[PDB]
Design a protein around this motif. Structure first.
Motif, PDB file in Angstrom:
ATOM      1  N   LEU B  68     -30.065 -17.715 -26.764  1.00 18.54           N
ATOM      2  CA  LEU B  68     -28.805 -17.339 -27.372  1.00 18.54           C
ATOM      3  C   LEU B  68     -28.775 -17.804 -28.811  1.00 18.54           C
ATOM      4  O   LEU B  68     -29.531 -18.693 -29.201  1.00 18.54           O
ATOM      5  CB  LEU B  68     -27.645 -17.947 -26.589  1.00 18.54           C
ATOM      6  CG  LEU B  68     -27.548 -17.522 -25.123  1.00 18.54           C
ATOM      7  CD1 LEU B  68     -26.476 -18.350 -24.437  1.00 18.54           C
ATOM      8  CD2 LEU B  68     -27.227 -16.042 -25.026  1.00 18.54           C
ATOM      9  N   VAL B  73     -22.862 -23.992 -38.076  1.00 16.41           N
ATOM     10  CA  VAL B  73     -21.735 -24.866 -38.388  1.00 16.41           C
ATOM     11  C   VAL B  73     -21.540 -25.899 -37.293  1.00 16.41           C
ATOM     12  O   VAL B  73     -21.510 -25.561 -36.110  1.00 16.41           O
ATOM     13  CB  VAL B  73     -20.429 -24.061 -38.571  1.00 16.41           C
ATOM     14  CG1 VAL B  73     -19.247 -25.005 -38.791  1.00 16.41           C
ATOM     15  CG2 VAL B  73     -20.561 -23.114 -39.750  1.00 16.41           C
ATOM     16  N   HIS B  74     -21.347 -27.149 -37.686  1.00 17.42           N
ATOM     17  CA  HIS B  74     -21.172 -28.215 -36.714  1.00 17.42           C
ATOM     18  C   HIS B  74     -19.748 -28.297 -36.194  1.00 17.42           C
ATOM     19  O   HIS B  74     -19.002 -29.223 -36.522  1.00 17.42           O
ATOM     20  CB  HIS B  74     -21.547 -29.571 -37.319  1.00 17.42           C
ATOM     21  CG  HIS B  74     -21.557 -30.705 -36.320  1.00 17.42           C
ATOM     22  ND1 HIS B  74     -21.889 -31.999 -36.670  1.00 17.42           N
ATOM     23  CD2 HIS B  74     -21.259 -30.742 -34.998  1.00 17.42           C
ATOM     24  CE1 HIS B  74     -21.797 -32.774 -35.603  1.00 17.42           C
ATOM     25  NE2 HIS B  74     -21.423 -32.033 -34.584  1.00 17.42           N
ATOM     26  N   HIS B  75     -19.386 -27.336 -35.356  1.00 16.78           N
ATOM     27  CA  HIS B  75     -18.147 -27.432 -34.607  1.00 16.78           C
ATOM     28  C   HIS B  75     -18.385 -28.432 -33.496  1.00 16.78           C
ATOM     29  O   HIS B  75     -19.428 -28.389 -32.850  1.00 16.78           O
ATOM     30  CB  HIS B  75     -17.777 -26.098 -33.959  1.00 16.78           C
ATOM     31  CG  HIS B  75     -17.493 -25.006 -34.898  1.00 16.78           C
ATOM     32  ND1 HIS B  75     -17.808 -23.697 -34.616  1.00 16.78           N
ATOM     33  CD2 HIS B  75     -16.888 -24.997 -36.099  1.00 16.78           C
ATOM     34  CE1 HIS B  75     -17.411 -22.932 -35.606  1.00 16.78           C
ATOM     35  NE2 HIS B  75     -16.840 -23.692 -36.514  1.00 16.78           N
ATOM     36  N   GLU B  76     -17.425 -29.293 -33.226  1.00 16.14           N
ATOM     37  CA  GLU B  76     -17.590 -30.190 -32.095  1.00 16.14           C
ATOM     38  C   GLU B  76     -17.262 -29.474 -30.792  1.00 16.14           C
ATOM     39  O   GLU B  76     -16.279 -28.738 -30.717  1.00 16.14           O
ATOM     40  CB  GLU B  76     -16.719 -31.435 -32.251  1.00 16.14           C
ATOM     41  CG  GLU B  76     -17.103 -32.332 -33.426  1.00 16.14           C
ATOM     42  CD  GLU B  76     -16.559 -33.743 -33.299  1.00 16.14           C
ATOM     43  OE1 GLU B  76     -15.674 -33.951 -32.496  1.00 16.14           O
ATOM     44  OE2 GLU B  76     -17.013 -34.605 -34.014  1.00 16.14           O
ATOM     45  N   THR B  78     -15.526 -29.199 -27.368  1.00 20.18           N
ATOM     46  CA  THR B  78     -14.205 -29.722 -27.043  1.00 20.18           C
ATOM     47  C   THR B  78     -13.998 -30.010 -25.560  1.00 20.18           C
ATOM     48  O   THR B  78     -12.909 -30.415 -25.154  1.00 20.18           O
ATOM     49  CB  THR B  78     -13.120 -28.724 -27.468  1.00 20.18           C
ATOM     50  OG1 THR B  78     -13.106 -27.640 -26.558  1.00 20.18           O
ATOM     51  CG2 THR B  78     -13.441 -28.168 -28.834  1.00 20.18           C
ATOM     52  N   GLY B  79     -14.995 -29.732 -24.740  1.00 21.09           N
ATOM     53  CA  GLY B  79     -14.805 -29.831 -23.300  1.00 21.09           C
ATOM     54  C   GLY B  79     -16.057 -29.429 -22.557  1.00 21.09           C
ATOM     55  O   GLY B  79     -17.114 -29.252 -23.158  1.00 21.09           O
ATOM     56  N   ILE B  80     -15.957 -29.338 -21.243  1.00 22.28           N
ATOM     57  CA  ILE B  80     -17.133 -29.063 -20.443  1.00 22.28           C
ATOM     58  C   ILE B  80     -17.499 -27.601 -20.476  1.00 22.28           C
ATOM     59  O   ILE B  80     -16.695 -26.730 -20.149  1.00 22.28           O
ATOM     60  CB  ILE B  80     -16.934 -29.527 -19.001  1.00 22.28           C
ATOM     61  CG1 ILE B  80     -16.709 -31.033 -18.993  1.00 22.28           C
ATOM     62  CG2 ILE B  80     -18.152 -29.146 -18.152  1.00 22.28           C
ATOM     63  CD1 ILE B  80     -16.250 -31.591 -17.667  1.00 22.28           C
ATOM     64  N   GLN B  81     -18.755 -27.342 -20.775  1.00 26.71           N
ATOM     65  CA  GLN B  81     -19.264 -25.989 -20.804  1.00 26.71           C
ATOM     66  C   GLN B  81     -20.491 -25.863 -19.932  1.00 26.71           C
ATOM     67  O   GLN B  81     -21.297 -26.788 -19.849  1.00 26.71           O
ATOM     68  CB  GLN B  81     -19.656 -25.623 -22.221  1.00 26.71           C
ATOM     69  CG  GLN B  81     -18.526 -25.505 -23.187  1.00 26.71           C
ATOM     70  CD  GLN B  81     -19.020 -25.172 -24.574  1.00 26.71           C
ATOM     71  OE1 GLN B  81     -18.357 -25.470 -25.567  1.00 26.71           O
ATOM     72  NE2 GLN B  81     -20.203 -24.574 -24.665  1.00 26.71           N
ATOM     73  N   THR B  82     -20.671 -24.693 -19.339  1.00 25.88           N
ATOM     74  CA  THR B  82     -21.893 -24.410 -18.617  1.00 25.88           C
ATOM     75  C   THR B  82     -22.575 -23.160 -19.138  1.00 25.88           C
ATOM     76  O   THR B  82     -21.986 -22.074 -19.158  1.00 25.88           O
ATOM     77  CB  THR B  82     -21.627 -24.238 -17.116  1.00 25.88           C
ATOM     78  OG1 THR B  82     -21.038 -25.432 -16.595  1.00 25.88           O
ATOM     79  CG2 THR B  82     -22.932 -23.957 -16.374  1.00 25.88           C
ATOM     80  N   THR B  83     -23.859 -23.293 -19.429  1.00 24.12           N
ATOM     81  CA  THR B  83     -24.702 -22.152 -19.754  1.00 24.12           C
ATOM     82  C   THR B  83     -25.653 -21.906 -18.608  1.00 24.12           C
ATOM     83  O   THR B  83     -26.241 -22.844 -18.078  1.00 24.12           O
ATOM     84  CB  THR B  83     -25.524 -22.385 -21.028  1.00 24.12           C
ATOM     85  OG1 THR B  83     -24.653 -22.630 -22.125  1.00 24.12           O
ATOM     86  CG2 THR B  83     -26.377 -21.171 -21.339  1.00 24.12           C
ATOM     87  N   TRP B 105     -24.997 -28.222 -18.509  1.00 25.11           N
ATOM     88  CA  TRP B 105     -23.668 -28.789 -18.600  1.00 25.11           C
ATOM     89  C   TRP B 105     -23.573 -29.543 -19.913  1.00 25.11           C
ATOM     90  O   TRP B 105     -24.389 -30.420 -20.185  1.00 25.11           O
ATOM     91  CB  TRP B 105     -23.443 -29.764 -17.442  1.00 25.11           C
ATOM     92  CG  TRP B 105     -23.408 -29.141 -16.073  1.00 25.11           C
ATOM     93  CD1 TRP B 105     -24.393 -28.416 -15.477  1.00 25.11           C
ATOM     94  CD2 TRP B 105     -22.372 -29.286 -15.087  1.00 25.11           C
ATOM     95  NE1 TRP B 105     -24.021 -28.075 -14.209  1.00 25.11           N
ATOM     96  CE2 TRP B 105     -22.801 -28.619 -13.945  1.00 25.11           C
ATOM     97  CE3 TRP B 105     -21.143 -29.931 -15.074  1.00 25.11           C
ATOM     98  CZ2 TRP B 105     -22.046 -28.582 -12.797  1.00 25.11           C
ATOM     99  CZ3 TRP B 105     -20.387 -29.899 -13.919  1.00 25.11           C
ATOM    100  CH2 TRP B 105     -20.828 -29.245 -12.808  1.00 25.11           C
ATOM    101  N   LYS B 114     -12.582 -39.164 -25.005  1.00 28.19           N
ATOM    102  CA  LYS B 114     -11.152 -38.894 -25.037  1.00 28.19           C
ATOM    103  C   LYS B 114     -10.595 -38.646 -23.641  1.00 28.19           C
ATOM    104  O   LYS B 114      -9.482 -39.065 -23.323  1.00 28.19           O
ATOM    105  CB  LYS B 114     -10.845 -37.715 -25.953  1.00 28.19           C
ATOM    106  CG  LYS B 114      -9.369 -37.428 -26.097  1.00 28.19           C
ATOM    107  CD  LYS B 114      -9.108 -36.386 -27.168  1.00 28.19           C
ATOM    108  CE  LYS B 114      -7.640 -35.988 -27.199  1.00 28.19           C
ATOM    109  NZ  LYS B 114      -6.777 -37.091 -27.702  1.00 28.19           N
ATOM    110  N   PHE B 115     -11.372 -37.962 -22.807  1.00 25.19           N
ATOM    111  CA  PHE B 115     -10.939 -37.636 -21.458  1.00 25.19           C
ATOM    112  C   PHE B 115     -11.817 -38.333 -20.439  1.00 25.19           C
ATOM    113  O   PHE B 115     -12.979 -37.976 -20.247  1.00 25.19           O
ATOM    114  CB  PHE B 115     -10.973 -36.137 -21.262  1.00 25.19           C
ATOM    115  CG  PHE B 115     -10.111 -35.430 -22.235  1.00 25.19           C
ATOM    116  CD1 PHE B 115      -8.756 -35.300 -22.025  1.00 25.19           C
ATOM    117  CD2 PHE B 115     -10.652 -34.928 -23.398  1.00 25.19           C
ATOM    118  CE1 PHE B 115      -7.964 -34.681 -22.964  1.00 25.19           C
ATOM    119  CE2 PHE B 115      -9.865 -34.305 -24.331  1.00 25.19           C
ATOM    120  CZ  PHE B 115      -8.518 -34.185 -24.115  1.00 25.19           C
ATOM    121  N   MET B 118     -13.819 -36.437 -17.565  1.00 28.67           N
ATOM    122  CA  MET B 118     -14.861 -35.463 -17.840  1.00 28.67           C
ATOM    123  C   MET B 118     -16.248 -35.967 -17.515  1.00 28.67           C
ATOM    124  O   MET B 118     -17.115 -35.189 -17.116  1.00 28.67           O
ATOM    125  CB  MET B 118     -14.822 -35.008 -19.284  1.00 28.67           C
ATOM    126  CG  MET B 118     -13.677 -34.111 -19.621  1.00 28.67           C
ATOM    127  SD  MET B 118     -13.755 -33.564 -21.310  1.00 28.67           S
ATOM    128  CE  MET B 118     -12.315 -32.545 -21.433  1.00 28.67           C
TER     129      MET B 118
END
Ligand SMILES: Nc1nc2c(ncn2[C@@H]2O[C@H](COP(=O)(O)OP(=O)(O)OP(=O)(O)O)[C@@H](O)[C@H]2O)c(=O)[nH]1
Lengths: 503, 226, 392, 551
Positions: B68, B73-76, B78-83, B105, B114-115, B118
């Motif tokens: 992919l 750009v270094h966006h942080e 923000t939460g749990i993602q799965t590819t 994950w 923060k959470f 998670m």
């Protein structure tokens, strides 16, 4: 008579006839210097002039540092001039317009409730241009200090009309139409039969011919002081005849609006009006003067030029009574024509109009007068503007022949307010076209619009307001309103309505 | 897993089932690769958590493994993602093809602190972790032993792989290969290198196949051990 | 056409971030510090007085200020054509609401430490860039939920509602890209700031098979870390579940998803070509239509497409820009005696034409071929809306 | 500057293949089509007929079908405009048709077959229609069939009269009438059997030839005068001694009922004439030529104008205001000209402006047959009749300005050209105007042009335009203008004074110097020299003062 009214600086304003309510509503005008002298102990060193002195303006004055900060800082960021800002004051929205010239800044602020932003932008351009017409560059008007007492009068009239329109049913109509019409690049013009145009043109041409036998050089061994450039005549607020250049006609009309001379003529019988000023027209001796003479609803403007065929002038001369007598005598000769001009106002010189109230509630001529298609006249109102010649056509006292009831009167207001928004796109298109023309020395843009329109529903019926811009070598603007029952093509209406139309 | 098995003609045919027009075909969560009617493939799936300090390329690493587009750009996160990544492989022990469905994950470094829930969420069933360090940041390298002992914690039977990132910025390298070798002398790690470059649809395959096969070797083998 | 967005803590004067784009493409460029200090300092100067500074503009660009609660000032500068104060004001509400979703109001208001926000607001950058950049969605501009008409009014809704019982939440929806195909009644009752941002948060992100993002709810629980789950079972198509702490994503096994979605696989596959086009393929659109935007004003939802006539110019990207610019114009004039229709004709020469009508609770806009007769614009939009009325 | 029009074809035929998105052309319908409804909605909104009604007393839809079949079964011999919205057609085999209209629209069709059995049934050649009688010519007999009126052709008396003439060889005879009964003239191209024009009296004893003449040259056309009812005007084709084509123009007067030539004029042609038209003021002759030259001559002057038509201008139709000339063609093409023969662009109604130098009817309705006739519907007058061989029939509608109250005169063309800043064209009209007949129009046209130009920044081109405009009064080709100089000299000299001041300000010097001489003002010379004092150009010097003393 009027000679005693002549001012030491040569200005004359002679008139003979036959703001506490606004101070709850915040408003301000200011002229500021952009050159800071922080070393100075003087307070408000930035303000060269302001008006009014009131509670209404004091709150805006107290935040003036915002306007100065934005004017320089935003320009440094975008590379372009700041044009406006919007603030809430005491819970009310206010729009402020900016105009910058020669390191000085002009600001006008008005409430959003009475004045939509696009009206304000046209008003600041109108004020800066009228001030330039009367005084030359803006510093000549403001920095002199001594001019303040008359600048206050100019602004006092400006604010009164802006905040309480029509307060200074025909008068209510004028208030409804003023929002659009006073900002057009042209003047209201009355369409006349060729028989009246020829009589008016012939009489008006006498001034340009300047056949002043009584003032001849061989009689006085003197060169005549001014060359007449041209003139224009108005009746009851309508221009009927002009020999003057389009740009000069618009600047002069703007002067007459700011002193309310034209709308005053529309209501009252003036026994005499004489105005004389030095003026500063767009052309390029360089001295020009404006003489205005009014009588019995007529207002006649003449521009005079120093040098050329005429003698040079220096200092600040008073009005030449000989030129004034020549203008007054010419205007007096038109009194016998007055019954015919009034007949043209009494009738519909344009298309036939129908009343909106009717829809919720010789014949060859009347069919020729139908702008719209079909056996029924669906036309309610229109404004036709010839942008090249500076003239526009509207309904007149015909609006009083229309019933003017709860349906019709609201619909007139809706028409003018919508047309103000329509012009915003047309103005943007025209400026872009001029910019491109100079740049020659975009896809998905919404800007290059030829037509816009809106349909409205009403009750005591569908009411359609449409406008069109023409970008061809003969640019035009047309606004028409008609009943929804009949479909119309802007080209057919534009052809029929603009055909044969010239100043 | 047979090295460079995908370079063989049989290997080319299996790559074709995940490619269309020489580009990756991404799969939905319950979508599967379509086999020829004569072909039967053993499908395995793994739960991999990607961990490390912000700016180490965890998102970029997964995109490269997934084929992919890699973000610039270094966006942080923000939460749990799965590819979910599909990749065929030939086994050296069985001579059969096994196709993998890798779940990557990726909680994000900031999101984990923060959470509080998670981190356990990413550990519900996890059976592998990826530990990233940058070639251009010694601190992420020197903190690595802590990450290896603290993120994996005490858990038995868990796969841990260390991957270097930003190798392509070679002029900015803070950590020489000598130091990485010294690290491997104490840890015996399956070190991998990724250059997370943002040419054509198969270009990503040629570069990423090395790491996917190395990843497949540990995940597949440890599954045979279990 | 550069765009810059600035955010500062109002009390400290310290920028929290700056974001930028050019031509709708995201960029790293930031404003000079002395300029930034003047942009905020002027706003706070007004704040020392009762007078609020809301906007300003220049001949080429516009700038908008907003003040949120006690803690945030947002400033946006844009050179983009079609920009207006309403367009920027709605965008700043969407930017603020995005900040609320990521860190919440409890953290964002009453700020105790600017540094905490400096690290936590970076999380919002991807979504903020989406608002500043080019997109296929109009929910940010319209404050309506972007929607698509489902292949069935029965099976999709019935399955979705039964699944909601299976998942234990009243709030479930299915969307393709940013477009909702179906949703439960709990999901539909969410207020605009939440209902619009949620699908934008999902559709603005790089594609993933599954997600669990923290959301602070703009309504009801802005102080509580509720979570948004999605499942991308098919490419371009995912469920959203608005959830409390349960279920965990690991418990949403493939067998559960097969039981509830395999029976719909065929119409779900159909939903993919449907994604780009809000209407059924058999819908009787006039051949002059280049694109469509339909809003239901009471139900807070709308349809959008540029698909109906692919062969003509403009390109799809160009068509969307014309519709967004037109909606913005409609939003400030025809929309808040009672306006019912509007239209545009563009140049040069035979340029593109646009129409809008409102019938009761629903408003339609069209983008039309340059050759379409101008006198037919109203009757075409009216007939199209009536044909659409049974669908929305 | 262009004219905007729309076309109405009174037919039900599908064969026209009119585009359904084209709003400029209309067709009638009985009980390709994808945009037809949109066009219908506009047509109904405007209260145009669309599907025609069949009502018991008036079967308009069905009676129109018979008319279309009449045109195909037999040639129309004659079409005449009885009233501004009423017309009649006459067909071979004697069928008469009468149409009644409202604006451009057809309201009823009447077919009258009563005459069919009354005729000798020889081929007609030409005809004259009735207020009280019908006259028919024949190709093969020297007889005029005469039908006297007092179905509506029921109160009939039938007779015919012998006509002196040549042996019949299928003679292409033509007829004309001055005022129904008062005069009839019959003529043909080629003592009584050599004569080719006959003056016919109208008596209770029937038609008789009062006198006959033989012309020197075969006629191109014949007309009766409106202002001179006893004059027969002809245009004849002739050849010079140098073997070049000429248009003869001859006036024949009836004196004691003897027709004889009174005057002859000749106009050289670049090629042989193919058509003739006279204007509404009867002071200009317009001739079409084979090589597509258009030639105009003014009878009161030696002045002619030339233009090149694109169309091979076989038929010409002058508008009754005299402002517009149309050039038709057998090819179905139409071109519009100024009285000055400046080309005017033309457009059919559309959502956008796009004028063309010429209009091709074939482009819009695929007509299958040659165009035969154009006529302005003179019994405002914005309707032009078009007839094709074997149909279709229809009317071309011109949009006229509201502010001009529907008028399209020469004054209005000046206003329209000035509206578009087409100054030379406006000047050419001003030169086309006769100061001795149209003085009010000449003063207005000049004033519009000069007032337009004096508002402008001066350029060398505009110096010429201003000078030329005043030159139309100061340097006439006609010295007889002295008769009316006293009426016009004042307003024109006032414009000249304005020009002097305008050119002095731009330091042109020489023109202002000469204008003062033509103006003859005592003091105006004093502005000359005064400027010189600051320029060094003392061309007049002290002479200005001597001239002031002499004046
Ligand atoms: N040149 C280069 N840049 C890289 C590489 N890996 C990451 N980057 C850059 O590092 C930045 C952030 O990468 P991420 O993938 O977001 O790192 P992350 O671990 O996902 O950061 P979080 O989302 O906070 O966990 C971007 O600006 C990328 O361009 C690499 O291999 N080469």
């Amino acid at each position: 008579e009027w000679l005693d009214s002549v001012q030491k600086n040569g200005e004359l304003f002679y008139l003979e006839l036959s703001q506490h309510s606004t101070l709850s509503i915040p408003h301000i005008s200011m002229y500021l210097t952009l050159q800071l002298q922080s070393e100075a102990a003087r307070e408000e060193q930035e303000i060269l002039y302001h008006y009014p002195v009131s509670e209404a303006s004091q709150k805006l004055k107290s935040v003036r540092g915002i306007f100065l900060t934005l004017c320089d800082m935003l320009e440094s960021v975008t590379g372009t001039q700041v044009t406006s800002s919007s603030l809430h004051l005491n819970g009310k929205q206010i729009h402020v317009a900016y105009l910058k010239e020669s390191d000085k800044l002009l600001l006008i602020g008005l409430p959003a409730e009475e004045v939509p932003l696009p009206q304000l932008r046209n008003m600041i351009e109108d004020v800066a241009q009228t001030l330039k017409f009367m005084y030359g560059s803006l510093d000549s008007a403001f920095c002199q200090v001594e001019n303040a007492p008359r600048l206050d009068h100019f602004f006092s009239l400006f604010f009164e009309r802006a905040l309480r329109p029509g307060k200074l049913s025909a008068q209510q109509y004028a208030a409804a139409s003023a929002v659009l019409l006073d900002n057009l690049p042209g003047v209201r013009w009355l369409v006349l039969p060729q028989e009246l145009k020829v009589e008016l043109d012939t009489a008006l041409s006498d001034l340009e011919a300047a056949d002043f036998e009584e003032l001849s050089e061989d009689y006085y061994d003197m060169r005549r002081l001014y060359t007449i450039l041209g003139s224009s005549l108005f009746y009851k607020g309508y221009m009927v005849c002009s020999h003057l250049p389009k740009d000069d006609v618009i600047e002069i009309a703007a002067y007459c609006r700011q002193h309310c001379l034209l709308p005053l003529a529309a209501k009252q019988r003036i026994g005499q009006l004489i105005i004389w000023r030095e003026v500063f027209p767009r052309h390029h001796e360089g001295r020009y003067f404006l003489l205005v003479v009014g009588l019995r609803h007529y207002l006649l403007c003449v521009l005079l030029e120093a040098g050329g065929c005429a003698s040079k002038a220096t200092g600040n001369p008073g009005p030449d009574c000989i030129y004034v007598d020549q203008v007054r005598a010419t205007l007096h000769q038109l009194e016998g024509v007055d019954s015919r001009i009034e007949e043209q106002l009494a009738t519909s010189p344009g298309p036939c109009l129908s009343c909106a109230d009717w829809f919720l509630a010789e014949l060859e001529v009347y069919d020729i007068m139908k702008l719209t298609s079909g056996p029924e006249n669906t036309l309610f109102h229109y404004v036709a503007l010839e942008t090249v010649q500076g003239i526009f056509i509207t309904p007149t006292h015909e609006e009083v022949a229309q019933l003017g009831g709860s349906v019709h009167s609201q619909l007139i207001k809706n028409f003018h307010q919508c047309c103000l928004s329509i012009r915003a796109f047309f103005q943007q298109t025209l400026k872009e076209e001029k910019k491109k023309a100079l740049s020659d020395g975009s896809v998905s843009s919404l800007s290059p619009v030829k037509e816009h329109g809106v349909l409205f529903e009403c009750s005591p019926m569908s009411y359609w307001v449409v406008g069109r811009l023409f970008l061809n070598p003969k640019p035009q603007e047309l606004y028409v309103c008609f009943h929804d029952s009949v479909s119309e093509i802007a080209i057919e209406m534009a052809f029929k309505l603009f055909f044969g139309l010239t100043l | 897993i047979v090295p460079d098995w995908h370079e063989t003609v049989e290997g080319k045919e299996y790559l074709a089932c995940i490619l269309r027009k020489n580009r990756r075909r991404e799969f939905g969560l319950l979508e599967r690769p379509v086999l020829p009617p004569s072909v039967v493939i053993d499908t395995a799936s793994y739960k991999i958590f990607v961990s490390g300090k912000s700016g180490v390329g965890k998102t970029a690493l997964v995109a490269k493994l997934a084929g992919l587009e890699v973000p610039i750009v270094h966006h942080e996160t923000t939460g749990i993602q799965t590819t979910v990544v599909f990749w065929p492989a030939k086994l050296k022990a069985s001579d059969c093809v096994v196709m993998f469905r890798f779940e990557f994950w990726d909680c994000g470094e900031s999101a984990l602190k923060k959470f509080d829930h998670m981190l356990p969420a990413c550990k519900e069933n996890a059976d592998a972790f990826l530990f990233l360090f940058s070639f251009t940041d010694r601190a992420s390298f020197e903190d690595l032993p802590g990450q290896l002992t603290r993120v994996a914690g005490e858990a038995p039977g868990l796969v841990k792989i260390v991957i270097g990132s930003k190798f392509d910025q070679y002029m900015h390298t803070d950590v020489p290969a000598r130091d990485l070798t010294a690290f491997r002398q104490a840890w015996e790690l399956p070190l991998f290198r990724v250059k997370s470059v943002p040419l054509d649809g198969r270009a990503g395959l040629a570069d990423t196949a090395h790491v996917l096969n190395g990843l497949a070797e540990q995940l597949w083998h440890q599954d045979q051990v279990a | 056409s550069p765009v810059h967005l600035l955010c500062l803590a109002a009390s400290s004067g310290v920028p929290l971030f700056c974001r930028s784009s050019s031509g709708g493409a995201p960029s790293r460029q930031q404003l000079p510090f002395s300029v930034i200090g003047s942009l905020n300092g002027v706003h706070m100067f007004g704040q020392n007085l009762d007078v609020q500074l809301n906007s300003a503009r220049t001949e080429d660009t516009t700038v908008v200020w907003k003040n949120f609660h006690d803690s945030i000032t947002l400033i946006v500068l844009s050179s983009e054509e079609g920009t207006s104060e309403l367009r920027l004001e709605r965008m700043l509400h969407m930017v603020f609401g995005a900040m609320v979703l990521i860190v919440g109001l409890e953290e964002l208001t009453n700020i105790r430490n600017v540094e905490r926000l400096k690290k936590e607001l970076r999380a919002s950058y991807c979504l903020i860039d989406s608002f500043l950049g080019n997109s296929e969605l109009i929910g940010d501009l319209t404050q309506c939920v972007d929607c698509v008409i489902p292949p069935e009014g029965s099976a999709m809704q019935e399955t979705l509602s039964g699944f909601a019982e299976a998942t234990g939440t009243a709030f479930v929806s299915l969307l393709v890209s940013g477009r909702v195909v179906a949703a439960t009644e709990g999901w539909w009752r969410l207020g605009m700031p939440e209902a619009v941002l949620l699908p934008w948060l999902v559709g603005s992100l790089p594609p993933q098979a599954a997600r669990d993002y923290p959301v602070y709810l703009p309504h009801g629980s802005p102080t509580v870390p509720h979570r948004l789950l999605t499942l991308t079972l098919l490419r371009g198509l995912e469920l959203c579940l608005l959830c409390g702490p349960r279920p965990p994503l690991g418990q949403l096994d493939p067998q559960l998803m097969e039981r509830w979605w395999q029976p719909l696989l065929e119409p779900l596959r159909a939903c993919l070509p449907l994604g780009p086009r809000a209407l059924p393929e058999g819908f009787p659109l006039h051949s002059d239509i280049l694109g469509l935007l339909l809003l239901h004003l009471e139900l807070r939802r709308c349809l959008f497409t540029v698909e109906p006539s692919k062969d003509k110019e403009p390109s799809p990207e160009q068509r969307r820009r014309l519709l967004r610019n037109f909606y913005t114009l409609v939003a400030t004039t025809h929309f808040p005696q009672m306006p019912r229709a509007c239209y545009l004709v563009l140049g040069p020469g035979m340029g593109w034409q646009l129409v809008a009508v409102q019938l009761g609770l629903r408003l339609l806009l069209l983008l039309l071929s340059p050759h379409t007769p101008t006198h037919g614009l109203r009757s075409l939009a009216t007939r199209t809306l009536q044909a659409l009325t049974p669908l929305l | 500057s262009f004219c905007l029009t729309e076309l109405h074809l009174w037919s039900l035929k599908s064969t026209l293949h009119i585009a359904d998105r084209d709003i400029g052309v209309y067709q009638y319908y009985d009980k390709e089509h994808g945009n037809l409804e949109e066009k219908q909605r506009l047509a109904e909104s405007r209260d145009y007929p669309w599907t025609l009604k069949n009502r018991r007393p008036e079967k308009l839809r069905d009676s129109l079908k018979e008319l279309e079949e009449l045109m195909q079964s037999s040639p129309c011999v004659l079409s005449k405009w009885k009233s501004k919205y009423i017309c009649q057609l006459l067909f071979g085999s004697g069928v008469l048709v009468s149409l009644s209209l409202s604006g451009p629209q057809l309201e009823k069709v009447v077919i009258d077959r009563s005459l069919v059995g009354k005729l000798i049934s020889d081929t007609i050649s030409d005809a004259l229609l009735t207020d009280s009688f019908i006259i028919l010519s024949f190709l093969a007999q020297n007889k005029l069939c005469f039908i006297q009126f007092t179905l509506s052709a029921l109160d009939l008396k039938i007779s015919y009269y012998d006509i002196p003439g040549p042996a019949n060889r299928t003679i292409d005879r033509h007829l004309a009438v001055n005022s129904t009964q008062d005069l009839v003239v019959c003529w043909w191209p080629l003592e009584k059997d050599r004569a080719n024009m006959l003056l016919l009296g109208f008596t209770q004893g029937g038609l008789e030839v009062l006198s006959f003449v033989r012309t020197e040259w075969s006629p191109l056309d014949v007309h009766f005068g409106t202002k001179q009812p006893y004059q027969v005007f002809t245009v004849e084709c002739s050849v010079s001694v140098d073997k070049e084509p000429m248009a003869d123009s001859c006036i024949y007067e009836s004196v004691r009922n003897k027709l004889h030539c009174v005057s002859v004029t000749r106009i050289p042609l670049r090629s042989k004439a193919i058509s003739c038209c006279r204007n509404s003021t009867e002071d200009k002759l317009i001739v079409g030529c084979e090589d597509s030259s258009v030639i105009l001559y003014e009878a009161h002057r030696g002045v002619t104008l030339l233009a090149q038509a694109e169309l091979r201008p076989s038929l010409i139709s002058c508008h009754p205001s005299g402002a517009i000339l149309l050039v038709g063609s057998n090819q179905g093409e139409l071109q519009i000209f100024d009285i000055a023969l400046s080309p005017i662009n033309i457009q059919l109604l559309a959502e956008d402006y796009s004028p063309k130098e010429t209009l091709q009817f074939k482009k819009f309705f695929d007509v299958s047959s040659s165009l035969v006739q154009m006529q302005w519907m003179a019994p405002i007058c914005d309707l032009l009749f078009l007839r094709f061989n074997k149909g279709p029939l229809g009317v071309l509608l011109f949009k006229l300005g509201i502010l001009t109250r529907g008028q399209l005169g020469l004054v209005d063309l000046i206003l329209q050209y000035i509206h578009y800043s087409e100054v030379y064209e406006a000047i050419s009209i001003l030169r086309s105007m006769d100061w001795d007949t149209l003085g009010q129009q000449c003063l207005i046209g000049m004033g519009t042009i000069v007032n337009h130009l004096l508002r402008q920044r001066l350029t060398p081109e505009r110096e010429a335009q201003l000078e030329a405009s005043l030159g139309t009064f100061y340097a006439p080709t006609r010295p007889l203008l002295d008769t009316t100089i006293l009426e016009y000299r004042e307003p024109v000299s006032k414009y000249a004074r304005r020009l002097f001041h305008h050119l002095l300000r731009y330091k042109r010097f020489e023109k202002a110097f000469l204008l003062a001489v033509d103006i003859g003002a005592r003091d105006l010379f004093m502005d000359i020299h005064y400027l010189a004092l600051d320029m060094g150009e003392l061309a007049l010097a002290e002479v200005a003062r001597r001239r002031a003393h002499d004046i």
